[PDB]
Swiss-Prot record, chains F, G, H, I, J:
Residues 2-20 are annotated as: Interaction with PSEN1. The chain holds residues 688 to 713 of 770 of the full protein. The record marks 13 as: Susceptible to oxidation. The record marks 18-19 as: Cleavage. Changing residue 2 to C: Causes formation of an artifactual disulfide bond with PSEN1. The record marks 11 as: Implicated in free radical propagation. This is P3(42). The gene is APP. The lineage of its organism: Eukaryota, Metazoa, Chordata, Craniata, Vertebrata. It comes from the Eukaryota. It comes from Homo sapiens (Human).
């Protein structure tokens, strides 16, 4: 179980690159 | 189980690149 | 089970590129 | 099962490119 | 079990690059 | 196979994306 | 096969996307 | 196989992404 | 195999990403 | 195998990322 809230991320970025992935949450 | 809320992300970005993927949530 | 709400993403981006995909949610 | 609500995404973007896909939800 | 809230991240960054991944939450 | 590759070569493909 | 590739080459294809 | 590769070469592919 | 590789070579691939 | 490798060579791959 996981919870994540009220946060922020700011500025230009190189993205997300991901392999074989099962059941994850990816914000990128 | 997962929960994610009220957050933000700001600025120009290189996106998301993803392999074989099962049941994930991807915001990008 | 998953929940995601009230969030935002801002700025021009290179999109999402995805391999073989089963049952996922992709916002991009 | 999945739930996603009350969010937004803002700015011009390069879309979504997806391989073989089964039962997914793609907003792009 | 995990909880993360009210935080921020600021400045241009090299993204996230990820191997085989099961059930994680990735902000990037 | 003889001679150089600068692009992508695949024997069998199921799903996936190739950008030259 | 003999001689150079700059694009994409596939033996068997199911689904997927190619951009030259 | 003879001669140099600067790109990508795959025997069997399920999912995944290739950028030259 | 004969001659130098500067790119990527894979026998069997499930998922994953290749950038030349 | 003959000649030097400056890139990446893999027998079997599940997940992972390769940057040349």
């Amino acid at each position: 179980g996981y919870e994540v809230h009220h946060q922020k991320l700011v500025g230009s970025n190189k993205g997300a690159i991901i392999g074989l992935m099962v059941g994850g949450v990816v914000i990128a």
